[PDB]
Design a protein around this motif. Structure first.
Motif: not given
Length: 360
Positions: A129-135
Protein backbone atom coordinates in the motif's frame (compact mmCIF):
# COMPACT_ATOMS: atom_id res chain seq x y z
CA UNK A 1 -13.50 -8.98 -38.15
CA UNK A 2 -16.64 -8.22 -36.10
CA UNK A 3 -19.74 -5.99 -36.06
CA UNK A 4 -19.35 -2.34 -35.04
CA UNK A 5 -18.66 -2.02 -31.30
CA UNK A 6 -21.42 -0.01 -29.62
CA UNK A 7 -20.76 -0.17 -25.88
CA UNK A 8 -21.81 1.75 -22.78
CA UNK A 9 -19.83 2.04 -19.60
CA UNK A 10 -21.84 1.09 -16.54
CA UNK A 11 -19.96 2.61 -13.63
CA UNK A 12 -20.64 1.44 -10.05
CA UNK A 13 -18.37 3.84 -8.12
CA UNK A 14 -20.45 6.33 -6.10
CA UNK A 15 -23.38 4.43 -7.68
CA UNK A 16 -22.92 6.54 -10.81
CA UNK A 17 -24.84 4.32 -13.31
CA UNK A 18 -25.97 1.32 -11.31
CA UNK A 19 -27.21 0.50 -8.76
CA UNK A 20 -29.16 3.58 -7.63
CA UNK A 21 -30.59 1.61 -4.66
CA UNK A 22 -28.59 -0.14 -1.91
CA UNK A 23 -29.68 -3.19 0.17
CA UNK A 24 -32.42 -4.24 -2.23
CA UNK A 25 -31.73 -7.23 -4.49
CA UNK A 26 -35.01 -7.00 -6.40
CA UNK A 27 -34.66 -3.27 -7.11
CA UNK A 28 -30.95 -3.45 -8.08
CA UNK A 29 -31.84 -6.16 -10.64
CA UNK A 30 -34.85 -4.25 -12.06
CA UNK A 31 -32.69 -1.10 -12.30
CA UNK A 32 -30.09 -3.08 -14.30
CA UNK A 33 -32.61 -4.66 -16.68
CA UNK A 34 -34.41 -1.33 -17.14
CA UNK A 35 -31.04 0.25 -17.95
CA UNK A 36 -30.08 -2.53 -20.39
CA UNK A 37 -33.42 -2.14 -22.20
CA UNK A 38 -32.78 1.60 -22.70
CA UNK A 39 -29.29 1.02 -24.02
CA UNK A 40 -30.48 -1.77 -26.32
CA UNK A 41 -33.31 0.41 -27.71
CA UNK A 42 -30.67 2.90 -29.01
CA UNK A 43 -28.27 0.30 -30.57
CA UNK A 44 -25.87 -0.49 -27.70
CA UNK A 45 -24.66 -4.10 -28.23
CA UNK A 46 -22.12 -4.34 -25.34
CA UNK A 47 -22.25 -3.57 -21.59
CA UNK A 48 -18.95 -2.71 -19.89
CA UNK A 49 -19.73 -3.13 -16.20
CA UNK A 50 -17.42 -2.03 -13.38
CA UNK A 51 -17.18 -5.19 -11.27
CA UNK A 52 -14.20 -3.82 -9.23
CA UNK A 53 -14.73 -0.09 -8.63
CA UNK A 54 -12.51 0.01 -5.53
CA UNK A 55 -10.38 -3.09 -4.60
CA UNK A 56 -13.68 -4.85 -4.08
CA UNK A 57 -16.07 -7.13 -5.98
CA UNK A 58 -19.59 -6.92 -7.34
CA UNK A 59 -19.29 -10.72 -7.31
CA UNK A 60 -18.58 -13.59 -4.93
CA UNK A 61 -14.82 -13.75 -4.47
CA UNK A 62 -12.40 -15.74 -2.31
CA UNK A 63 -9.93 -12.84 -2.73
CA UNK A 64 -11.69 -9.45 -2.73
CA UNK A 65 -14.34 -8.08 -0.32
CA UNK A 66 -17.93 -7.29 -1.35
CA UNK A 67 -18.28 -3.80 -2.81
CA UNK A 68 -19.69 -1.08 -0.51
CA UNK A 69 -21.74 0.26 -3.43
CA UNK A 70 -24.17 -2.67 -3.16
CA UNK A 71 -25.00 -2.10 0.56
CA UNK A 72 -23.19 0.96 1.95
CA UNK A 73 -20.61 -1.17 3.80
CA UNK A 74 -17.54 -2.83 2.36
CA UNK A 75 -17.24 -6.55 3.04
CA UNK A 76 -21.01 -6.81 3.59
CA UNK A 77 -22.59 -9.77 1.84
CA UNK A 78 -25.60 -8.56 -0.23
CA UNK A 79 -27.27 -12.02 -0.10
CA UNK A 80 -26.79 -12.68 -3.82
CA UNK A 81 -23.99 -12.67 -6.36
CA UNK A 82 -24.91 -9.95 -8.90
CA UNK A 83 -22.42 -10.85 -11.64
CA UNK A 84 -24.09 -13.96 -13.13
CA UNK A 85 -27.37 -12.00 -13.36
CA UNK A 86 -25.63 -9.03 -14.97
CA UNK A 87 -24.02 -11.30 -17.59
CA UNK A 88 -27.03 -13.51 -18.28
CA UNK A 89 -29.42 -10.53 -18.65
CA UNK A 90 -26.98 -8.90 -21.08
CA UNK A 91 -26.64 -12.12 -23.13
CA UNK A 92 -30.38 -12.65 -23.21
CA UNK A 93 -30.69 -9.29 -25.00
CA UNK A 94 -27.97 -10.22 -27.51
CA UNK A 95 -25.41 -7.95 -25.83
CA UNK A 96 -21.80 -8.76 -25.03
CA UNK A 97 -20.55 -8.23 -21.43
CA UNK A 98 -17.13 -6.85 -20.54
CA UNK A 99 -16.10 -6.97 -16.90
CA UNK A 100 -14.43 -3.67 -15.92
CA UNK A 101 -11.72 -3.61 -13.26
CA UNK A 102 -9.87 -0.74 -11.58
CA UNK A 103 -6.52 -2.37 -10.74
CA UNK A 104 -4.63 -0.18 -8.21
CA UNK A 105 -7.29 1.89 -6.36
CA UNK A 106 -7.88 1.06 -2.67
CA UNK A 107 -9.65 4.14 -1.26
CA UNK A 108 -11.50 7.24 -2.49
CA UNK A 109 -10.68 10.76 -1.34
CA UNK A 110 -10.18 11.07 2.44
CA UNK A 111 -11.39 7.56 3.46
CA UNK A 112 -9.50 5.83 6.28
CA UNK A 113 -7.16 2.88 5.64
CA UNK A 114 -8.20 1.56 9.11
CA UNK A 115 -11.91 1.33 8.14
CA UNK A 116 -11.11 -1.52 5.68
CA UNK A 117 -12.31 -5.01 6.77
CA UNK A 118 -9.78 -7.50 8.19
CA UNK A 119 -9.63 -9.81 5.17
CA UNK A 120 -9.16 -6.91 2.71
CA UNK A 121 -5.97 -7.69 0.73
CA UNK A 122 -4.50 -4.25 1.59
CA UNK A 123 -5.12 -5.00 5.33
CA UNK A 124 -3.51 -8.43 4.97
CA UNK A 125 -0.60 -7.06 2.88
CA UNK A 126 0.17 -3.52 4.16
CA UNK A 127 3.55 -3.55 2.36
CA UNK A 128 1.58 -3.37 -0.94
CA UNK A 129 0.00 0.00 0.00
CA UNK A 130 1.15 3.49 -1.02
CA UNK A 131 -0.41 6.77 0.13
CA UNK A 132 -0.60 9.49 -2.53
CA UNK A 133 -2.34 12.73 -1.50
CA UNK A 134 -5.67 11.82 0.08
CA UNK A 135 -5.82 8.27 -1.36
CA UNK A 136 -4.15 4.88 -1.05
CA UNK A 137 -3.12 2.58 -3.94
CA UNK A 138 -1.59 -0.81 -4.56
CA UNK A 139 2.00 -0.35 -5.72
CA UNK A 140 2.19 -1.18 -9.49
CA UNK A 141 5.92 -2.06 -9.16
CA UNK A 142 5.54 -5.03 -6.83
CA UNK A 143 5.42 -8.48 -8.47
CA UNK A 144 3.09 -9.68 -5.68
CA UNK A 145 0.72 -6.77 -6.43
CA UNK A 146 0.61 -7.74 -10.12
CA UNK A 147 0.05 -11.42 -9.27
CA UNK A 148 -2.84 -10.55 -6.92
CA UNK A 149 -4.45 -8.40 -9.67
CA UNK A 150 -3.92 -11.18 -12.22
CA UNK A 151 -5.38 -13.67 -9.75
CA UNK A 152 -8.28 -11.33 -9.06
CA UNK A 153 -9.07 -11.09 -12.81
CA UNK A 154 -8.52 -14.85 -13.39
CA UNK A 155 -11.15 -15.73 -10.78
CA UNK A 156 -13.76 -13.82 -12.81
CA UNK A 157 -12.64 -15.28 -16.17
CA UNK A 158 -12.79 -18.79 -14.65
CA UNK A 159 -16.15 -18.45 -12.87
CA UNK A 160 -18.26 -16.29 -15.22
CA UNK A 161 -19.29 -16.24 -18.91
CA UNK A 162 -17.75 -12.86 -19.66
CA UNK A 163 -17.00 -11.85 -23.24
CA UNK A 164 -14.30 -9.33 -22.26
CA UNK A 165 -12.04 -7.94 -19.54
CA UNK A 166 -11.68 -4.14 -19.45
CA UNK A 167 -9.44 -1.68 -17.55
CA UNK A 168 -10.10 2.05 -17.63
CA UNK A 169 -7.71 5.03 -17.32
CA UNK A 170 -6.36 4.85 -13.74
CA UNK A 171 -2.80 3.62 -13.47
CA UNK A 172 -0.30 5.72 -11.42
CA UNK A 173 -2.01 8.75 -9.69
CA UNK A 174 0.89 11.15 -10.41
CA UNK A 175 4.60 11.74 -10.77
CA UNK A 176 5.29 11.94 -6.98
CA UNK A 177 4.15 8.37 -6.15
CA UNK A 178 6.18 7.08 -3.19
CA UNK A 179 7.59 3.85 -4.64
CA UNK A 180 11.26 4.55 -3.81
CA UNK A 181 11.73 1.29 -1.89
CA UNK A 182 10.07 -0.74 -4.65
CA UNK A 183 12.12 0.99 -7.35
CA UNK A 184 15.30 0.22 -5.39
CA UNK A 185 14.33 -3.46 -5.12
CA UNK A 186 13.07 -4.09 -8.73
CA UNK A 187 14.00 -1.14 -11.01
CA UNK A 188 17.49 -2.34 -11.98
CA UNK A 189 18.55 1.34 -11.87
CA UNK A 190 16.46 2.16 -14.94
CA UNK A 191 14.97 5.60 -15.59
CA UNK A 192 12.12 5.63 -13.03
CA UNK A 193 9.47 6.82 -15.52
CA UNK A 194 10.22 4.04 -17.98
CA UNK A 195 10.25 1.56 -15.12
CA UNK A 196 6.79 2.72 -14.10
CA UNK A 197 5.53 2.49 -17.67
CA UNK A 198 6.85 -1.04 -17.91
CA UNK A 199 5.21 -2.01 -14.58
CA UNK A 200 1.93 -1.07 -16.21
CA UNK A 201 2.88 -2.90 -19.43
CA UNK A 202 3.79 -5.97 -17.39
CA UNK A 203 0.41 -5.99 -15.65
CA UNK A 204 -1.44 -5.72 -18.99
CA UNK A 205 0.74 -8.48 -20.45
CA UNK A 206 0.23 -10.85 -17.48
CA UNK A 207 -3.51 -10.22 -17.47
CA UNK A 208 -3.85 -10.87 -21.19
CA UNK A 209 -1.83 -14.11 -20.86
CA UNK A 210 -3.86 -15.28 -17.87
CA UNK A 211 -7.13 -14.56 -19.73
CA UNK A 212 -5.95 -16.39 -22.88
CA UNK A 213 -4.67 -19.44 -20.97
CA UNK A 214 -8.17 -19.87 -19.51
CA UNK A 215 -10.35 -18.54 -22.36
CA UNK A 216 -8.55 -17.79 -25.67
CA UNK A 217 -11.49 -15.90 -27.21
CA UNK A 218 -12.23 -13.62 -24.24
CA UNK A 219 -10.94 -10.16 -25.25
CA UNK A 220 -8.80 -7.79 -23.16
CA UNK A 221 -9.01 -4.05 -23.63
CA UNK A 222 -8.08 -0.78 -21.98
CA UNK A 223 -9.54 2.72 -22.12
CA UNK A 224 -6.74 5.18 -21.45
CA UNK A 225 -7.04 8.97 -21.57
CA UNK A 226 -7.42 10.50 -25.01
CA UNK A 227 -3.94 11.95 -25.26
CA UNK A 228 -0.88 9.70 -25.15
CA UNK A 229 1.71 12.43 -25.89
CA UNK A 230 1.49 15.98 -27.27
CA UNK A 231 3.39 16.96 -30.43
CA UNK A 232 5.64 19.13 -28.20
CA UNK A 233 6.87 16.10 -26.16
CA UNK A 234 7.24 13.78 -29.15
CA UNK A 235 6.87 14.83 -32.82
CA UNK A 236 4.92 11.57 -33.59
CA UNK A 237 2.42 12.61 -30.87
CA UNK A 238 -0.87 14.40 -31.37
CA UNK A 239 -1.48 18.06 -32.26
CA UNK A 240 -2.80 18.78 -28.80
CA UNK A 241 -1.75 20.40 -25.54
CA UNK A 242 -3.84 18.50 -22.96
CA UNK A 243 -2.77 16.16 -20.18
CA UNK A 244 -0.61 13.24 -21.33
CA UNK A 245 -1.23 9.63 -20.25
CA UNK A 246 2.43 8.79 -20.91
CA UNK A 247 3.72 10.67 -17.81
CA UNK A 248 1.05 11.60 -15.25
CA UNK A 249 -0.37 8.13 -15.35
CA UNK A 250 2.46 6.15 -17.09
CA UNK A 251 -0.07 4.60 -19.46
CA UNK A 252 2.15 4.06 -22.51
CA UNK A 253 -0.62 3.23 -24.93
CA UNK A 254 1.61 3.15 -27.99
CA UNK A 255 3.72 0.34 -26.46
CA UNK A 256 0.61 -1.60 -25.55
CA UNK A 257 -0.41 -1.40 -29.22
CA UNK A 258 3.05 -2.05 -30.70
CA UNK A 259 3.52 -5.18 -28.55
CA UNK A 260 -0.12 -6.40 -28.73
CA UNK A 261 -0.57 -6.29 -24.94
CA UNK A 262 -4.31 -5.70 -25.50
CA UNK A 263 -6.96 -6.83 -28.01
CA UNK A 264 -8.65 -3.46 -28.00
CA UNK A 265 -8.02 0.14 -26.98
CA UNK A 266 -10.53 2.86 -26.16
CA UNK A 267 -9.00 6.32 -25.93
CA UNK A 268 -11.29 8.67 -24.05
CA UNK A 269 -11.91 11.48 -26.55
CA UNK A 270 -14.09 13.51 -24.18
CA UNK A 271 -13.67 16.83 -26.03
CA UNK A 272 -15.57 18.73 -28.76
CA UNK A 273 -14.60 19.07 -32.39
CA UNK A 274 -12.46 22.21 -32.83
CA UNK A 275 -11.37 22.43 -29.16
CA UNK A 276 -7.90 23.95 -29.25
CA UNK A 277 -6.32 21.91 -26.42
CA UNK A 278 -7.69 18.55 -27.61
CA UNK A 279 -9.50 18.67 -30.94
CA UNK A 280 -11.69 15.57 -31.43
CA UNK A 281 -11.17 15.64 -35.21
CA UNK A 282 -7.39 15.62 -34.80
CA UNK A 283 -7.36 12.85 -32.20
CA UNK A 284 -9.59 10.39 -34.15
CA UNK A 285 -7.11 10.72 -37.06
CA UNK A 286 -4.10 10.26 -34.82
CA UNK A 287 -5.51 7.17 -33.07
CA UNK A 288 -6.77 5.63 -36.38
CA UNK A 289 -3.13 5.89 -37.42
CA UNK A 290 -1.75 4.34 -34.19
CA UNK A 291 -3.44 0.98 -34.82
CA UNK A 292 -2.73 0.69 -38.59
CA UNK A 293 -1.18 -2.70 -39.39
CA UNK A 294 -1.92 -4.21 -35.98
CA UNK A 295 -4.76 -6.41 -34.87
CA UNK A 296 -5.71 -4.11 -32.02
CA UNK A 297 -9.29 -2.97 -32.33
CA UNK A 298 -9.71 0.76 -31.81
CA UNK A 299 -12.90 2.09 -30.28
CA UNK A 300 -13.56 5.77 -29.54
CA UNK A 301 -14.48 6.68 -25.95
CA UNK A 302 -17.35 9.18 -26.33
CA UNK A 303 -17.85 11.88 -23.67
CA UNK A 304 -21.63 12.22 -23.77
CA UNK A 305 -21.61 13.16 -20.06
CA UNK A 306 -20.48 16.63 -21.25
CA UNK A 307 -23.78 18.43 -21.91
CA UNK A 308 -22.85 22.13 -21.53
CA UNK A 309 -22.31 22.31 -17.74
CA UNK A 310 -20.03 25.15 -16.51
CA UNK A 311 -18.06 22.44 -14.67
CA UNK A 312 -16.79 21.38 -18.17
CA UNK A 313 -16.51 24.92 -19.59
CA UNK A 314 -19.83 24.69 -21.46
CA UNK A 315 -18.48 21.84 -23.62
CA UNK A 316 -21.34 19.90 -25.10
CA UNK A 317 -20.42 16.58 -26.68
CA UNK A 318 -23.92 15.04 -26.44
CA UNK A 319 -25.09 17.87 -28.79
CA UNK A 320 -22.53 16.87 -31.48
CA UNK A 321 -22.47 13.05 -31.03
CA UNK A 322 -23.91 12.42 -34.54
CA UNK A 323 -21.11 14.53 -36.04
CA UNK A 324 -18.45 12.72 -33.95
CA UNK A 325 -19.48 9.16 -34.85
CA UNK A 326 -20.14 10.10 -38.52
CA UNK A 327 -16.50 11.26 -38.53
CA UNK A 328 -15.39 8.03 -36.77
CA UNK A 329 -16.93 5.98 -39.63
CA UNK A 330 -14.63 7.66 -42.17
CA UNK A 331 -11.72 5.71 -40.61
CA UNK A 332 -11.75 1.95 -41.30
CA UNK A 333 -9.35 1.43 -38.36
CA UNK A 334 -12.07 2.63 -35.98
CA UNK A 335 -14.25 -0.36 -35.11
CA UNK A 336 -16.87 1.38 -32.95
CA UNK A 337 -17.56 3.45 -29.85
CA UNK A 338 -17.87 3.31 -26.06
CA UNK A 339 -20.16 5.84 -24.37
CA UNK A 340 -19.40 7.44 -21.00
CA UNK A 341 -21.76 6.78 -19.46
CA UNK A 342 -24.92 4.67 -19.55
CA UNK A 343 -26.89 7.10 -17.30
CA UNK A 344 -26.50 9.81 -19.95
CA UNK A 345 -28.24 7.61 -22.51
CA UNK A 346 -30.88 6.65 -19.91
CA UNK A 347 -31.61 10.22 -18.80
CA UNK A 348 -31.65 12.13 -22.13
CA UNK A 349 -34.19 11.61 -24.93
CA UNK A 350 -32.06 13.74 -27.33
CA UNK A 351 -29.03 11.47 -26.87
CA UNK A 352 -31.41 8.50 -27.41
CA UNK A 353 -32.74 10.04 -30.61
CA UNK A 354 -29.22 10.73 -31.86
CA UNK A 355 -27.94 7.18 -31.09
CA UNK A 356 -31.03 5.64 -32.72
CA UNK A 357 -30.24 7.55 -35.93
CA UNK A 358 -26.60 6.39 -35.89
CA UNK A 359 -27.51 2.77 -35.12
CA UNK A 360 -30.79 2.03 -37.02
Amino acid sequence: NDKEMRAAWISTVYNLDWPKTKNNEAKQKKEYTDLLDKLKSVGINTAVVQVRPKSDALYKSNINPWSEYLTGTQGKDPGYDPLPFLIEEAHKRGMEFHAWFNPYRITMADESIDKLPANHPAKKNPSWVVKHGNKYYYDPGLPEVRKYIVDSIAEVVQNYDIDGVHFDDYFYPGVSFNDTATYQKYGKGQNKDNWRRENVNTLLRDVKASIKSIKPNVVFGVSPAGIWRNKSSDPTGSDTSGNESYVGTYADTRAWIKQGLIDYVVPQLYWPIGLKAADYSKLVAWWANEVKGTNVDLYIGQGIYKQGQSSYGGQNIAKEIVQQVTLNRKYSEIKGSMYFSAKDIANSTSIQKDLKSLYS
